[PDB]
Amino acid sequence: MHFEAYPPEVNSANIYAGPGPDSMLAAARAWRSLDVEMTAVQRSFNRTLLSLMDAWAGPVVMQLMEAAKPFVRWLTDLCVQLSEVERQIHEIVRAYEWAHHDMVPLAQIYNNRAERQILIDNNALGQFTAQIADLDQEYDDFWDEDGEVMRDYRLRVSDALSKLTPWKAPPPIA
């Protein structure tokens, strides 16, 4: 995505509009809880298997532990993925906050445009023409700045998502 395809009125307005990160912050809390509860589940599952082994030692239960091994491992991998989700959501919220902060405010763009129109309104004798071009260079600098702010935002979000790997289906037991 090349957001320099678009003028700064577009990139700046788009980042300032919308509801904010509250709903991402709430989801992060929710993912934390799951991490907590599923770790407890894992820990309870290990204890259940071990106390079954302690209560009835011998070949039948050992074969039961063997047939549970894939699911025990899967459960461990699940918990490791769970503990990464909160982190990365907060990394994304930060990325959004820095994009919001670093983007050029609209007022600054509108002022550039309004100033430029006043010079033109008064340019019968042509003596503001170079100042008019300085303002166009300034506008182009806003376009450039927003372009690179959106580039860095894309790359931060992209890196964060790349660390949230896909859920694998649990293996069976017996």
Binding site: I15, A30, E37, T48, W56, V93, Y96, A169, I173, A174
Partner: protein, 85 residues
């Protein structure tokens, strides 16, 4: 020991309830993610997180099937060694 298998089945279903319950409790929060702004980066993030929550829910449903069948197996195991005395 037959009784040990029965005890384990109960504990495995209790663990299943907990997995099912935690999934459900927070599902409204994981799936309600909105883009924080109107840009396409924000939207790609929110859309990913919603889909990621949905796939996590399929996954726990699958793991609750796997646990229930374990519990059923332990029970049926216990009724064989108890009905052999």
């Amino acid at each position: 020991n037959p009784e040990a298998l029965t005890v384990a089945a109960t504990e495995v279903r209790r663990i299943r309830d907990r997995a099912i319950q935690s999934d459900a409790q927070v599902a409204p929060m994981t799936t309600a993610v909105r883009p924080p702004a109107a840009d396409l980066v924000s939207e790609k993030a929110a859309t990913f997180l919603v889909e990621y929550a949905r796939k996590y829910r399929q996954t726990i449903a699958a793991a609750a099937v796997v646990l229930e069948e374990f519990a059923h197996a332990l029970t049926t195991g216990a009724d064989k060694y108890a009905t052999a005395e």
